Every structure is written in structure tokens, then in C-alpha cells.
Amino acid sequence: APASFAALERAAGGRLGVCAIDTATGRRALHRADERFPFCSTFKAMLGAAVLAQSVAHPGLLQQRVTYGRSDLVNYSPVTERHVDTGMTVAELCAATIQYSDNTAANELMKRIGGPAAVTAYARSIGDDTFRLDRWETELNTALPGDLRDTTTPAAMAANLRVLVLGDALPPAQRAQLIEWLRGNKVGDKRIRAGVPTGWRVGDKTGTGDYGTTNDVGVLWPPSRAPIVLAVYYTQTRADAKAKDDVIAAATRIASATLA
Numbered sequence: 001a002p003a004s005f006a007a008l009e010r011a012a013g014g015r016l017g018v019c020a021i022d023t024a025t026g027r028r029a030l031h032r033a034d035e036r037f038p039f040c041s042t043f044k045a046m047l048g049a050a051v052l053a054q055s056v057a058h059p060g061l062l063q064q065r066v067t068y069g070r071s072d073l074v075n076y077s078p079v080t081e082r083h084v085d086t087g088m089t090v091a092e093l094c095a096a097t098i099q100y101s102d103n104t105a106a107n108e109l110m111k112r113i114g115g116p117a118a119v120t121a122y123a124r125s126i127g128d129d130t131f132r133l134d135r136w137e138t139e140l141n142t143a144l145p146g147d148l149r150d151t152t153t154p155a156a157m158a159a160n161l162r163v164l165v166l167g168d169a170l171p172p173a174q175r176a177q178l179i180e181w182l183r184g185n186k187v188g189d190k191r192i193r194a195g196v197p198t199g200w201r202v203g204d205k206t207g208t209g210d211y212g213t214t215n216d217v218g219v220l221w222p223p224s225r226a227p228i229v230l231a232v233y234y235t236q237t238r239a240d241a242k243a244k245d246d247v248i249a250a251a252t253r254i255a256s257a258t259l260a
């Protein structure tokens with residue numbers, strides 16, 4: 001098996017980006033940590049945080065029912081497609097978008113809170129000047145080489161996760177909620193979760209896009225040691241490239257070994 005990030009990139013082809021932070025010591029494991037990558041679904045973690053942050057000023061926000069129609073449904077909406085008739089609450093849409101990566105849920109939340117610009121504004125509010133959300137689902141996953149729309153860096157996303165999950169960017173109640181949503185990711189078993197020991201607990205958000213883009217970002221809680229924050233981004237040369245779950249699992253093993 002490839003033993004370094006550089007070696008893994010050469011084996012897999014494409015372009016790999018990693019930022020892993022050992023929160024005990026502040027040591028980092030890095031590869032292209034300051035390069036931009038298309039974030040795809042991983043922004044949904046930021047979207048959830050942005051909604052929770054708005055809920056601090058308006059506690060009733062999470063309660064609000066959002067109704068949407070058949071024509072609002074975009075591809076990959078396994079939860080929202082079941083509730084065209086009732087609609088769903090803001091909190092329900094957050095859980096759906098983070099835990100099942102539901103695309104319509106993301107769009108409907110963004111309509112409520114002020115669109116792509118609102119998520120970008122939220123990123124700036126927590127000290128992320130790098131993140132930019134430009135488009136809606138599913139266009140934001142085009143992942144075109146050379147396009148800066150809908151990108152961030154592994155280092156910027158890892159820093160966001162550190163302050164959101166382990167820091168005080170959110171008040172305790174909202175911080176606890178974000179953690180519950182991330183720990184409940186249902187669609188990431190073959191990625192970060194596949195590259196850590198089963199004793200480690202994971203809260204994460206995956207993403208996948210065109211150009212075989214394969215991403216996963218989150219926080220890892222080892223049983224007897226301080227948490228590690230891990231952001232992994234990966235993208236490939238051909239537009240029809242296949243996503244590579246195993247690249248993320250391998251990057252995770254290397255990061256966890258390095259910070260052992």
C-alpha cells in the first residue's frame with residue numbers, strides 16, 4: 001500500500017489534497033493543503049452550521065416548515081422525494097442534507113437562508129476567507145479543472161471543522177447538534193470511516209462530483225487521545241473518471257499513521 005500522500009497520488013493518478021490536524025499538539029499532516037478543490041457535497045457541513053448560526057438569533061428557524069414541489073426535486077434527494085406532500089422542517093432538511101447528502105434539502109435550506117452568498121458570508125464570519133459557494137445543486141458539482149467556483153482548500157475546511165466542532169464558533173447547543181448530524185452520516189462507510197480503526201468515532205461529510213471528484217471531511221475521535229481533524233479532497237483528469245472511495249480510505253490511514 002502507498003505509504004505517503006505523494007505516493008498515493010502517484011498510484012491513483014489525479015490530484016489529492018489533505019489537511020490533518022492533531023488537536024493535542026497542533027502537528028499537521030499535509031499534501032496540497034493550500035490548493036483549491038471542488039468541494040461538492042462537503043459544503044453541506046458548512047450549510048448546516050450556517051443554519052444553526054442563524055437559529056441563534058431566531059430560535060424558531062429550526063421549527064419552520066418548508067414546502068417544495070415535484071419540480072423542486074433535483075437528482076440525489078432520497079429523503080426529500082418522500083415528503084413532497086407534507087414538506088419538511090428546517091431541522092429535518094439539515095439532517096437529510098448532512099446524513100443522507102440530500103440535494104433538494106440543501107437547495108431548500110439555501111432558499112430559506114439567503115442562497116450561496118449566505119453560506120459564503122457565514123464562512124467569512126468564522127474566519128474562512130477561502131471558501132466560496134457560487135452555485136446550487138447539482139450544478140455546483142461540475143468540478144471543472146481551472147474553475148474556482150464552489151471550491152475551498154483542505155486547510156481552510158479543516159480549520160472550519162476545528163472551530164465548529166471543537167471550538168466555540170457555535171454556542172454549545174448548536175455545536176452539539178452539528179456533531180450529532182456529522183456523526184450520523186449514513187453514506188460515508190467506504191471513505192474516512194474505512195481508514196480508521198473501528199474504535200475511533202467519526203463525524204464527517206462526504207462529497208462526490210464530476211471529474212471523478214471524491215471528498216470526505218470530518219473529525220476523528222480516537223478512544224484514548226485528542227481528536228484529529230481531517231479534510232480530504234481528490235479530483236481527476238478525465239470528466240468521466242470514476243470516484244475512488246479507496247483513495248480516501250488510504251489517505252485516512254496515512255494521516256492517522258503520521259499523527260500516531
Ligand SMILES: NC(=O)[C@@H]1CC[C@@H](NOS(=O)(=O)O)CN1C=O
Pocket residue numbers: 039040041042076100101102103137138141187188205206207208209
Ligand atoms: N453529485 C452530487 O451532488 C453528490 C453525489 C450524491 C450525493 N451524495 O454523495 S456523497 O459523496 O456526498 O455522499 C450528493 N453529492 C455530494 O457531493
